[PDB]
Amino acid sequence: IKEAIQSVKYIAENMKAQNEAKEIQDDWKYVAMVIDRIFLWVFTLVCILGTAGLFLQPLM
């Protein structure tokens, strides 16, 4: 009788813990996306600077 209500409490607590773990995994994915974007911009600038300063400018 009381066991069913305690089981519903257990299900609710399990789903809350699973939600918090999914939040932590989303944070780990978002920090990887941030590192990906900053190195995208850095290597885009380095590639454009290299193809400008080393390939066209002396060879003209």
């Binding site: 780990w28 990887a32 590192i35 990906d36 380095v46 290299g50 193809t51 390939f55």
Partner: protein, 52 residues
């Protein structure tokens, strides 16, 4: 030819691009290790919460 006096601009550009693409794979293995990571195996630090 194999003349060691001066190097061509195209071979220098190829070496440049090979160095940076190798650095790109050593960055992408790090971001793949950062991505697949769970709280049941690793604890997330405090200084990474503010900076990254």
């Amino acid at each position: 030819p194999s003349t060691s006096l001066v190097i061509p601009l195209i071979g220098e550009y190829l070496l440049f691009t090979m160095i940076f693409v190798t650095l790109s794979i050593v960055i992408t293995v790090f971001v793949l290790n950062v991505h697949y990571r769970t709280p049941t195996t690793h604890t997330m630090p405090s200084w990474v919460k503010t900076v990254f």
